[PDB]
Amino acid sequence: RREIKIEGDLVLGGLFPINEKGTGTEECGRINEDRGIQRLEAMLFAIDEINKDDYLLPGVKLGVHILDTCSRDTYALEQSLEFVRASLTQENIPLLIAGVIGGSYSSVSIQVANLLRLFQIPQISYASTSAKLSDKSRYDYFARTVPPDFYQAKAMAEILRFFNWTYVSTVASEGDYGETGIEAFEQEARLRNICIATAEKVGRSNIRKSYDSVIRELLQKPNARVVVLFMRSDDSRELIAAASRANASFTWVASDGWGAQESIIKGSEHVAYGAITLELASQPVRQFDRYFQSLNPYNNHRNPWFRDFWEQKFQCSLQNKRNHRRVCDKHLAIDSSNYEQESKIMFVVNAVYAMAHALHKMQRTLCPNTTKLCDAMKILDGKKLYKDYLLKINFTAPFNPNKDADSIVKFDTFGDGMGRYNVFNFQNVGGKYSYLKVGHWAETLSLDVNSIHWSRNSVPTSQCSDPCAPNEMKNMQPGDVCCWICIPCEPYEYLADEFTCMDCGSGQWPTADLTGCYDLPEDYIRWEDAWAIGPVTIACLGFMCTCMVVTVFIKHNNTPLVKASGRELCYILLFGVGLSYCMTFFFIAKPSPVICALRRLGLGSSFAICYSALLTKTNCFISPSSQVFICLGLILVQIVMVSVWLILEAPGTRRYTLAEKRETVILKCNVKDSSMLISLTYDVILVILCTVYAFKTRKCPENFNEAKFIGFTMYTTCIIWLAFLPIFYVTSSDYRVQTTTMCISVSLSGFVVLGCLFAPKVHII
Amino acid sequence: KVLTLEGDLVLGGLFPVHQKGGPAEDCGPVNEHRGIQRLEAMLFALDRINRDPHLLPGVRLGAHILDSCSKDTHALEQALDFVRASLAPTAITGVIGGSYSDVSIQVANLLRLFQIPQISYASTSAKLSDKSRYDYFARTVPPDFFQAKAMAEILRFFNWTYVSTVASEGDYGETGIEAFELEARARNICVATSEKVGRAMSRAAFEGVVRALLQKPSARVAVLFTRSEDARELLAASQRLNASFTWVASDGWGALESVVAGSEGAAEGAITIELASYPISDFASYFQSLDPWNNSRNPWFREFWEQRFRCSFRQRDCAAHSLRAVPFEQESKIMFVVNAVYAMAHALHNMHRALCPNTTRLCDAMRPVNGRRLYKDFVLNVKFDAPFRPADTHNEVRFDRFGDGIGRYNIFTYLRAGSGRYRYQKVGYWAEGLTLDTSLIPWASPSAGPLPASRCSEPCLQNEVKSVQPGEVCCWLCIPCQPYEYRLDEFTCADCGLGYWPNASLTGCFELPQEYIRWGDAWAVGPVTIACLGALATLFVLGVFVRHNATPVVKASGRELCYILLGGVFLCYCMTFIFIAKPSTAVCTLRRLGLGTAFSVCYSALLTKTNRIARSPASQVAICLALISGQLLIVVAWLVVEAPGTGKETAPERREVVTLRCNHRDASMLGSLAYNVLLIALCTLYAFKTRKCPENFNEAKFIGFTMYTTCIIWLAFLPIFYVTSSDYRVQTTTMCVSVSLSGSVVLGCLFAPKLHIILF
Ligand SMILES: CC(C)CCC[C@@H](C)[C@H]1CC[C@H]2[C@@H]3CC=C4C[C@@H](O)CC[C@]4(C)[C@H]3CC[C@]12C
Ligand SMILES: CC(C)CCC[C@@H](C)[C@H]1CC[C@H]2[C@@H]3CC=C4C[C@@H](O)CC[C@]4(C)[C@H]3CC[C@]12C
Ligand SMILES: CC(C)CCC[C@@H](C)[C@H]1CC[C@H]2[C@@H]3CC=C4C[C@@H](O)CC[C@]4(C)[C@H]3CC[C@]12C
Ligand SMILES: CC(C)CCC[C@@H](C)[C@H]1CC[C@H]2[C@@H]3CC=C4C[C@@H](O)CC[C@]4(C)[C@H]3CC[C@]12C
Ligand SMILES: CC(C)CCC[C@@H](C)[C@H]1CC[C@H]2[C@@H]3CC=C4C[C@@H](O)CC[C@]4(C)[C@H]3CC[C@]12C
Ligand SMILES: CC(C)CCC[C@@H](C)[C@H]1CC[C@H]2[C@@H]3CC=C4C[C@@H](O)CC[C@]4(C)[C@H]3CC[C@]12C
Ligand SMILES: CC(C)CCC[C@@H](C)[C@H]1CC[C@H]2[C@@H]3CC=C4C[C@@H](O)CC[C@]4(C)[C@H]3CC[C@]12C
Ligand SMILES: N[C@](CC1c2ccccc2Oc2ccccc21)(C(=O)O)[C@H]1C[C@@H]1C(=O)O
Ligand SMILES: N[C@](CC1c2ccccc2Oc2ccccc21)(C(=O)O)[C@H]1C[C@@H]1C(=O)O
Ligand SMILES: *[C@@H]1O[C@H](CO)[C@@H](O)[C@H](O)[C@H]1NC(C)=O
Ligand SMILES: *[C@@H]1O[C@H](CO)[C@@H](O)[C@H](O)[C@H]1NC(C)=O
């Protein structure tokens, strides 16, 4: 095998993916030019700079023991045993390893950390961004200068919150990065109250139908235009191509898998327009560029992989031993034309310098007053080096003289690098499509909306609904929990919850949304109204007229001594008329209290008295007195079973109506109106039947007035009964039926009193 | 030194042959029971397997056994040989080793990355069961939470809910108590005191912790999950302080006599548990027949012989000693070592059968041995009879889904024999459920309490209420509620009342309508007599007025006045009857109307008598009707001013005073009655002052006497009604008798002599 074993006072390990992984007999094949050679040369350049430095380890020379990984877990684990073989109690003398600058793959880093935690060897990764490595309970000697993968799920979640994008669609990829990202973003969205519409999953099969199905599923939702992507490069390219083929238009918010790469927008620049992508913040190193551009196979002997890298890059052979390749030109060199700096060279340099600074602080603290390798540092305890010195570093980037505030290299409590990302917006210029940096996320959000294209006119993506005021506007949840429809409820219903309108009260309006559950004030209480004062005055005038007639009859009762019982009949008729007149004034009571039962009793007593008076005249000294006594007993019995009607329910139960707005009811006199009308109509028809027989009967000329009066009263009673019942039977008005009934009653009382008092009026005059 | 044996398949091993050395050396003295005996047990198991035709007849099992020196740091560098062999090294198919928990944890962490299954024989750590960190670790011994569950089941069996757990300060004890607390709170077991015991704690600290344990009188049981030395020190402190407890200890105590060494007086009644195992007859013969001359496989055997038998190999004097003569005590973990070795061998045999069917030897499909398939598909799925099993016992070797053993413990009790010797006697076992016999335990015999640690206080759930918390969540203090404080819920007593006692329902205070509203027949007989007298008076009046018109004396007087007087007497009788009736709103209104009408008619009769004496019938009738109308108006005004109601409340404990009278105050009615009585008295006084004695003398004298008697009756019945202030039944009886006397006076007044004269 090949390795770098430069000696020194302190030796730092190294793990790089110099060879690409393979299958079959060849465990690992092609040389990885970008992630395996450039990073290795960057680490070597950083080590040389530290050795040449006068302020960082001036008396200590840093050696390197750099191995390969072949981009696989097993071979890296096999070589990691050489880092721990030197710490065990002549062909190949091992070198004590202070720390391992290794990584570049999440699985490789995980396996190496698992192996190294048992031997107390600190490890600093330069490219591994897996969230599993943040668990210090399993990797307690691991650190990294790159932020983990769930910082993007926070950065672009904040980006979504900035533009009020709450109901978005999320697309992930099969594996570990895509998953960990998608659950991290879901957690951040639920923390920020951002709804997720659909969650699609994309595998590595690259099926031509799965991508179209995903595009169709995303498209069948016109109220979710912002799409969040946690996908790898080729999967994202295939999804974008499928969207272009389906003629879709979305607002892609992607992760570092897209970034500012060009291979994804090839041939599909239309749908991808306006996409916002995150890219890890990284700055070029000019010193590394100068160091790398001055490397030749004849002067670089420390690197055993440089010959293979040169042959693979230039497709030539230095020693063409009958091979099918050209001879490498002696003037061949690498320049900016065919070489571009890798994005994590500065991260590798930062990791190496962090290890060097930790060692320098340990050397200064343990043994001062000298600059050399001390006896106390011979044991080289890894726990004290990592938990005390390595995790408490604070220094600026060695090769960044321009920026000093955003170039601080330090690890947090979990041993992870600071999360700095660049926001890129895919825009056009007028025929040229390119990415533009429109923001930056380093623990804070900062964008430039003016320079953003296709999102300056931000796409409206509300939470599947709009804010509706609680004014009787019920929110019913569809199958999607985040969606709302804001369907109204009935205006009379008063809102009490969110998922239902929860009507309160039968006939009561609300006030704003909830407080209107109190009883609605009834409009039945209307005293001294237009149709109330007039009937009161009419009843008072009728009562005064009846009283005057009674007084006149009393005065005119001395000389006409023949009417021994006629005076009593006139007195009882006047008493009944007065009782009826007082009963009319009882119904106009605006409050309508429980005394309406007493009003019913008085009306029944008046009707019974009128019937008895009519019967007594039709029938006609001791015998008239007996007849009057019998009539009085009959009236008492009539009152008795009239009061029997009240032995069931005097006030009632409740009085409602179809209208839910007024509800103008007495609320205390809700007795059976049909039963009351049936009981009232029976007396009228009985009186009519009793009086019709007397009218046909021939009476004496002296007593013809009684027959004529009975005949006149019989006609009025039938008309009153026929008029009263139909109006209240069906309409059941609040007060129109009551005033008409009172008017009919007072008119009948006036008619009967005039009929029975016409003769005394003529006699008096 | 490395123990290597030739074979087709090599099985790794790791035993604590040497004890911890410290700063002087990595490891020092050689363990004789945990390092040598277990290693020899493994060697014997491999020899038996190689000599077993039914277990790997063609494949010969090798051995690569190393020494961990009872240290985890040394264990890692020792175990960094199996991985080197997998990468002349001999490839192995799995290690059978790991006695201490830390050593096993380190070895499992190292070998997980290289797909090497590991079967432990003595590691009982509770943190080795999760597969998120140990993908290839298995063990024959059960973990500690199984014995925690066994202790919890023992506590529940004896209905011991109030316990006091005592833990340790090291890695052993904290996890055990943490696991036991959840299972105790899941089994309704209450923990009173929880503390930690340290190795550096002196005698004063142990005395203090014993005093803290004694601070709870109701906690006489202590659940010890500690080490042997901590338990011994705690028992010593308890004996020094003369403390008595029923200790329920774990495998840390077990059946060891070192804990009860010098403290036999306080350890009586302790229920200790121990891991169940049996001695192997063949292993004892194999180990006892071992000598350094005929045993070259073991590199540490010479050092073990030198340490056990005081001698040196420099001088030829160690040949006299022999293991046969000296007693041999078999280690309790020999069973588990043999079981682990046999389980690994059976897994290898099953995988060979499933991968090399035709051939009976090792085939090309098993030249690389992969840990994943062997562990997941074969090692876990083993179900075979344990080797060298006793005659009729049914031990079975199998693994759970966490790669753990089957929990089988033996329950021990520290009995006190009659001869005076103290010994441990097994009283049951715990395989899946507790199987205590309760026949060998000295305190389990029927006596005056088998050390009952019931609870903080006696629960009350039969008829009382338990809602008082003195500070402990599960301490139930029960105080019987008042008879009127009927129980409605578990944490409250409703104030509904005492008369509404639920009929074995305790839900909503089911009302009892057993109330004495009125006397149906006990006291209504007198009211019945009054009603009968009133009816007789009414019948007498009815017979009276038939011939009243014919009689000139009645004709001269007001016939209508006599009729209304008879009607007033009938009204008085009806008022008495309605007073006798059961009270109600309608009943109260009827009674008030009746008394008002009676007073009105009495006043009208007095007024018309005065008018007749002074001097017309029409005017008298009009005046009396106007007076009656005014009285009715004031009565109805009072009735509408104060509304009537029903429902009376009184003292608790079944007063039965409900519905005694209408809920409307009668102060206004009494005032109106007094006013009309005063008016009647003034009218009677005016009539007496008038000198119309010569004419209508008998009737005037009778009327005056009746008025005087009525006034005297009213003035005598006012003080008793004012003074009683209670006893509604007696008050109603008094009112009825007063109105009956008033009616009797009314009927015996001037109307009666006129009727007598007419009859005669
Ligand atoms: C209307 C309510 C409040 C009171 C009850 C009705 C009263 C006022 C009525 C019912 C019967 C009536 C009596 C019937 C007959 C007679 C005989 C006559 O020769 C004089 C009037 C007189 C004595 C009446 C007076 C008034 C009277 C008592
Ligand atoms: C006494 C003779 C002259 C007959 C006249 C009777 C008059 C004064 C009576 C008969 C019916 C009476 C009404 C009956 C009911 C009510 C409702 C109450 O909430 C206020 C008083 C009021 C409005 C009464 C006022 C007085 C009234 C109008
Ligand atoms: C004043 C207004 C509210 C009307 C009240 C109802 C009046 C008219 C009713 C209610 C009860 C009735 C009385 C009931 C019973 C009797 C006994 C009978 O032998 C003569 C009539 C007489 C005395 C009635 C007269 C009229 C009466 C007083
Ligand atoms: C319902 C109860 C409480 C009423 C009690 C009073 C009754 C019995 C009284 C009050 C007024 C009385 C009437 C007053 C006047 C007369 C005229 C006379 O020529 C015959 C009797 C007669 C008709 C009386 C009958 C009895 C009478 C109706
Ligand atoms: C002046 C007197 C003699 C008139 C006749 C008696 C009157 C006052 C009596 C006779 C029947 C009685 C009614 C009988 C039953 C009930 C039902 C109860 O739930 C309320 C009271 C009420 C409605 C009573 C009111 C008073 C009443 C109408
Ligand atoms: C002169 C005579 C006839 C007048 C008789 C008036 C009677 C019928 C009136 C006067 C006062 C009234 C009572 C006043 C208040 C209440 C309480 C209510 O919750 C039920 C009805 C009830 C109990 C009424 C029943 C009828 C009543 C008793
Ligand atoms: C002269 C006769 C025929 C009619 C008038 C007398 C009777 C019916 C009148 C006189 C005074 C009146 C009362 C005056 C005031 C009130 C208070 C009011 O909140 C309810 C009605 C009530 C309780 C009235 C009921 C009817 C009443 C008792
Ligand atoms: N930094 C990465 C992140 C990486 C990744 C980034 C984008 C798309 C796919 C993807 O694959 C996974 C899968 C799991 C965890 C991390 C990743 C790392 O390996 O940790 C990787 C770029 C670094 C490198 O390999 O040089
Ligand atoms: N099975 C044990 C249990 C062991 C233990 C047992 C009783 C008292 C203290 C104590 O120390 C701890 C601490 C943590 C975990 C396990 C234990 C093991 O070492 O795993 C031990 C019998 C095995 C042996 O050493 O032979
Ligand atoms: C997001 O909403 C807030 C208020 O809800 C507003 O101030 C802000 O300008 C919005 N951002 C947009 C529309 O990009
Ligand atoms: C424990 O209580 C149960 C009833 O809950 C009883 O059957 C059992 O005998 C008790 N155990 C004793 C008293 O040891």
Coordinates of C-alpha atoms in Angstrom, one line a residue, chain A residues 179-493:
Chain A
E179 CA -34.4 11.7 5.4
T180 CA -32.6 13.4 8.2
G181 CA -33.1 16.7 6.3
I182 CA -36.8 16.1 5.8
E183 CA -37.6 15.3 9.4
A184 CA -35.4 18.2 10.6
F185 CA -37.3 20.5 8.3
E186 CA -40.6 19.1 9.5
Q187 CA -39.6 19.7 13.1
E188 CA -38.6 23.2 12.4
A189 CA -41.8 23.9 10.4
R190 CA -43.9 22.6 13.3
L191 CA -41.9 24.8 15.7
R192 CA -42.6 27.8 13.4
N193 CA -46.2 26.7 12.7
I194 CA -45.6 25.9 9.0
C195 CA -48.0 23.4 7.4
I196 CA -46.7 20.5 5.2
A197 CA -49.0 19.6 2.4
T198 CA -47.5 16.5 0.8
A199 CA -44.3 14.5 1.5
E200 CA -42.9 12.7 -1.5
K201 CA -40.1 10.2 -1.5
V202 CA -37.6 9.6 -4.4
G203 CA -35.5 6.5 -4.7
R204 CA -32.2 5.8 -6.5
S205 CA -33.9 3.6 -9.1
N206 CA -34.3 6.7 -11.4
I207 CA -37.6 5.3 -12.6
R208 CA -39.0 7.3 -15.5
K209 CA -42.5 7.0 -14.0
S210 CA -41.9 7.8 -10.3
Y211 CA -40.7 11.3 -11.1
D212 CA -43.7 12.0 -13.3
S213 CA -46.0 10.6 -10.5
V214 CA -44.3 12.9 -8.0
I215 CA -44.7 15.9 -10.4
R216 CA -48.4 15.1 -10.8
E217 CA -48.9 14.7 -7.1
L218 CA -47.3 18.1 -6.5
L219 CA -49.3 19.7 -9.4
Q220 CA -52.7 18.5 -8.2
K221 CA -52.7 21.2 -5.5
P222 CA -53.0 24.7 -6.9
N223 CA -52.7 26.4 -3.5
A224 CA -49.2 25.2 -2.7
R225 CA -46.6 26.7 -5.1
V226 CA -43.5 26.6 -2.8
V227 CA -41.7 23.3 -2.9
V228 CA -39.0 22.2 -0.5
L229 CA -36.3 19.8 -1.7
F230 CA -34.0 17.6 0.3
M231 CA -32.6 15.7 -2.7
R232 CA -29.2 14.6 -4.1
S233 CA -27.8 16.1 -7.3
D234 CA -28.9 13.6 -9.9
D235 CA -32.3 13.0 -8.2
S236 CA -33.0 16.8 -8.2
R237 CA -31.9 17.0 -11.8
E238 CA -34.3 14.2 -12.8
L239 CA -37.1 15.8 -10.8
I240 CA -36.5 19.2 -12.5
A241 CA -36.4 17.5 -15.9
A242 CA -39.7 15.7 -15.2
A243 CA -41.3 19.0 -14.1
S244 CA -40.1 20.6 -17.3
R245 CA -41.5 17.7 -19.4
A246 CA -44.8 18.1 -17.5
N247 CA -44.8 21.9 -18.1
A248 CA -45.2 22.6 -14.4
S249 CA -44.2 25.9 -12.6
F250 CA -43.2 25.8 -9.0
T251 CA -41.0 27.9 -6.5
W252 CA -38.3 25.4 -5.6
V253 CA -36.6 26.0 -2.2
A254 CA -33.7 23.4 -2.3
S255 CA -30.8 22.4 0.0
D256 CA -27.1 22.1 -0.6
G257 CA -27.8 19.2 -2.9
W258 CA -28.8 21.7 -5.6
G259 CA -26.8 24.8 -4.4
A260 CA -25.4 26.6 -7.4
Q261 CA -24.6 23.6 -9.6
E262 CA -24.9 23.9 -13.4
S263 CA -25.5 20.2 -14.3
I264 CA -29.1 20.5 -12.8
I265 CA -30.3 23.4 -15.0
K266 CA -29.0 21.8 -18.3
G267 CA -31.9 21.8 -20.7
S268 CA -34.6 22.7 -18.2
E269 CA -33.9 26.4 -17.3
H270 CA -37.6 27.3 -17.6
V271 CA -39.2 25.5 -14.7
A272 CA -36.1 26.0 -12.5
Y273 CA -36.3 29.8 -13.0
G274 CA -36.9 31.6 -9.7
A275 CA -35.6 28.8 -7.5
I276 CA -33.9 29.6 -4.2
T277 CA -31.1 27.3 -3.1
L278 CA -28.7 27.1 -0.2
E279 CA -25.0 26.7 -0.6
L280 CA -22.4 26.2 2.2
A281 CA -20.3 29.4 2.6
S282 CA -16.8 28.8 1.5
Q283 CA -14.0 31.2 0.4
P284 CA -11.1 30.4 -2.0
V285 CA -7.5 30.2 -0.8
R286 CA -5.0 31.9 -3.0
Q287 CA -2.0 30.5 -1.2
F288 CA -3.2 27.0 -1.8
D289 CA -3.8 27.9 -5.4
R290 CA -0.2 29.0 -5.7
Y291 CA 1.1 25.9 -3.9
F292 CA -1.0 23.5 -6.0
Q293 CA -0.2 25.2 -9.4
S294 CA 3.6 24.7 -8.7
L295 CA 3.4 20.9 -8.2
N296 CA 5.2 18.6 -10.6
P297 CA 5.8 14.8 -10.6
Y298 CA 9.6 15.4 -10.4
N299 CA 9.6 17.7 -7.3
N300 CA 6.7 16.3 -5.3
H301 CA 8.1 13.1 -3.7
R302 CA 6.1 13.1 -0.4
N303 CA 2.9 12.2 -2.2
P304 CA 2.9 8.6 -3.5
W305 CA -0.5 9.1 -5.3
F306 CA 0.7 12.1 -7.4
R307 CA 2.0 10.0 -10.3
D308 CA -1.3 8.2 -10.7
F309 CA -3.2 11.5 -10.4
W310 CA -1.0 13.1 -13.0
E311 CA -1.4 10.2 -15.4
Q312 CA -5.2 10.1 -14.9
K313 CA -5.6 13.9 -15.3
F314 CA -3.4 14.3 -18.4
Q315 CA -4.2 10.8 -19.9
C316 CA -0.5 10.1 -20.5
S317 CA 2.2 7.9 -19.0
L318 CA 5.5 9.1 -17.7
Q319 CA 7.1 5.7 -18.4
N320 CA 5.4 4.4 -21.5
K321 CA 6.3 0.7 -21.4
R322 CA 4.5 -0.4 -24.6
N323 CA 1.3 1.1 -23.2
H324 CA -1.6 2.6 -25.2
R325 CA -1.0 6.1 -24.0
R326 CA 1.1 9.1 -25.0
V327 CA 4.3 10.1 -23.3
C328 CA 3.7 13.0 -20.8
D329 CA 5.3 16.2 -22.0
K330 CA 8.2 17.5 -19.9
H331 CA 6.7 21.0 -20.1
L332 CA 3.2 19.9 -18.9
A333 CA 1.9 21.9 -15.9
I334 CA -1.4 22.5 -14.2
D335 CA -2.8 26.1 -14.2
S336 CA -6.1 27.9 -13.7
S337 CA -7.3 26.7 -17.1
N338 CA -7.5 23.0 -16.1
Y339 CA -7.6 23.3 -12.3
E340 CA -10.2 24.8 -9.9
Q341 CA -10.0 24.9 -6.1
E342 CA -12.3 22.5 -4.2
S343 CA -15.0 24.0 -2.0
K344 CA -13.7 22.5 1.2
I345 CA -10.0 23.3 1.0
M346 CA -10.5 26.1 3.5
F347 CA -12.4 23.7 5.8
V348 CA -9.4 21.3 5.6
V349 CA -7.0 24.1 6.4
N350 CA -9.3 25.2 9.3
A351 CA -9.3 21.7 10.7
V352 CA -5.6 21.3 10.6
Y353 CA -5.0 24.8 12.1
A354 CA -7.6 24.0 14.9
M355 CA -5.6 20.8 15.8
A356 CA -2.4 22.8 15.7
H357 CA -3.8 25.5 18.0
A358 CA -5.2 22.9 20.4
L359 CA -1.7 21.3 20.6
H360 CA -0.1 24.7 21.0
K361 CA -2.3 25.7 23.9
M362 CA -1.8 22.3 25.5
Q363 CA 2.0 22.7 25.2
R364 CA 1.8 26.3 26.6
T365 CA -0.4 25.3 29.6
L366 CA 1.2 22.0 30.6
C367 CA 4.8 23.0 30.5
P368 CA 5.6 26.8 30.3
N369 CA 9.0 28.5 30.2
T370 CA 10.1 26.3 27.4
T371 CA 9.5 25.6 23.7
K372 CA 9.9 21.8 23.1
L373 CA 8.3 18.5 23.5
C374 CA 7.9 18.0 27.3
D375 CA 7.8 14.9 29.4
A376 CA 4.3 15.7 30.6
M377 CA 3.2 15.8 26.9
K378 CA 4.7 12.3 26.2
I379 CA 1.6 10.5 27.5
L380 CA -0.6 12.9 25.3
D381 CA -3.9 12.4 27.0
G382 CA -6.7 12.7 24.5
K383 CA -9.5 13.5 26.9
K384 CA -7.8 16.6 28.2
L385 CA -6.7 17.6 24.7
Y386 CA -10.3 17.3 23.3
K387 CA -12.7 18.2 26.1
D388 CA -10.6 21.1 27.5
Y389 CA -8.4 22.5 24.7
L390 CA -9.8 21.5 21.4
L391 CA -13.5 22.4 22.2
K392 CA -12.5 25.8 23.6
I393 CA -10.6 27.3 20.6
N394 CA -11.3 30.8 19.2
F395 CA -9.1 32.0 16.3
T396 CA -9.6 33.7 12.9
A397 CA -9.0 32.0 9.6
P398 CA -5.2 31.8 9.0
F399 CA -5.5 32.8 5.3
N400 CA -8.4 35.4 5.5
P401 CA -6.9 38.8 6.1
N402 CA -10.0 40.6 4.7
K403 CA -12.8 39.2 7.0
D404 CA -12.2 38.9 10.7
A405 CA -15.7 38.8 12.2
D406 CA -17.2 36.1 10.0
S407 CA -14.0 34.0 9.8
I408 CA -13.8 32.8 13.4
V409 CA -13.1 29.1 13.8
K410 CA -14.6 27.5 16.9
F411 CA -16.7 24.5 17.9
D412 CA -19.9 24.5 19.9
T413 CA -20.8 22.2 22.8
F414 CA -21.5 19.4 20.3
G415 CA -18.2 19.9 18.5
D416 CA -19.7 21.2 15.3
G417 CA -18.6 24.1 13.1
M418 CA -20.5 27.4 12.7
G419 CA -23.4 27.2 10.3
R420 CA -22.9 29.7 7.5
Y421 CA -24.8 29.4 4.2
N422 CA -25.2 31.5 1.1
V423 CA -28.7 32.0 -0.5
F424 CA -28.7 31.7 -4.3
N425 CA -31.5 32.7 -6.6
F426 CA -31.6 31.3 -10.1
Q427 CA -32.3 34.3 -12.3
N428 CA -31.9 35.4 -15.9
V429 CA -30.1 38.4 -17.5
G430 CA -31.8 38.6 -20.9
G431 CA -30.7 35.4 -22.5
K432 CA -28.1 34.1 -20.0
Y433 CA -29.2 32.1 -17.0
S434 CA -26.9 32.1 -13.9
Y435 CA -27.1 32.0 -10.1
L436 CA -26.8 35.1 -8.0
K437 CA -26.1 35.3 -4.3
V438 CA -29.1 37.2 -2.8
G439 CA -28.5 36.5 0.9
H440 CA -26.5 34.9 3.6
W441 CA -27.5 32.8 6.7
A442 CA -25.0 32.8 9.6
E443 CA -27.2 32.2 12.7
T444 CA -29.4 35.0 11.3
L445 CA -31.5 35.7 8.3
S446 CA -30.5 38.4 5.8
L447 CA -31.7 38.5 2.2
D448 CA -32.0 41.1 -0.6
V449 CA -35.5 41.0 -1.9
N450 CA -34.8 43.7 -4.6
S451 CA -32.3 41.5 -6.4
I452 CA -34.5 38.4 -6.2
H453 CA -36.2 37.5 -9.4
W454 CA -39.6 35.6 -9.7
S455 CA -39.9 35.9 -5.9
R456 CA -39.9 39.7 -5.6
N457 CA -43.5 39.3 -6.8
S458 CA -43.8 36.7 -4.0
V459 CA -46.1 33.8 -4.8
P460 CA -49.1 33.9 -2.4
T461 CA -49.0 30.7 -0.4
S462 CA -51.4 31.0 2.5
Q463 CA -52.2 28.2 5.0
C464 CA -54.8 26.7 2.7
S465 CA -57.3 29.4 3.8
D466 CA -57.7 33.1 4.7
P467 CA -58.3 34.7 8.1
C468 CA -62.0 35.0 8.7
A469 CA -63.5 37.1 11.5
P470 CA -65.3 35.2 14.3
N471 CA -68.7 37.0 13.4
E472 CA -70.7 33.8 13.1
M473 CA -68.1 32.4 10.7
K474 CA -67.6 28.7 11.6
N475 CA -64.3 27.0 10.7
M476 CA -64.8 23.5 9.5
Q477 CA -61.7 21.4 9.0
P478 CA -61.5 19.4 5.7
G479 CA -59.5 16.2 5.4
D480 CA -56.4 18.3 5.6
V481 CA -55.8 19.5 9.1
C482 CA -54.2 22.8 8.1
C483 CA -57.0 23.7 5.6
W484 CA -59.9 25.9 6.6
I485 CA -63.1 26.7 4.7
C486 CA -64.7 29.4 7.0
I487 CA -68.4 28.4 6.4
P488 CA -71.0 30.7 8.0
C489 CA -73.5 29.4 10.5
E490 CA -77.1 30.7 11.1
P491 CA -77.2 34.4 12.1
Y492 CA -79.3 33.7 15.1
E493 CA -76.8 31.1 16.3

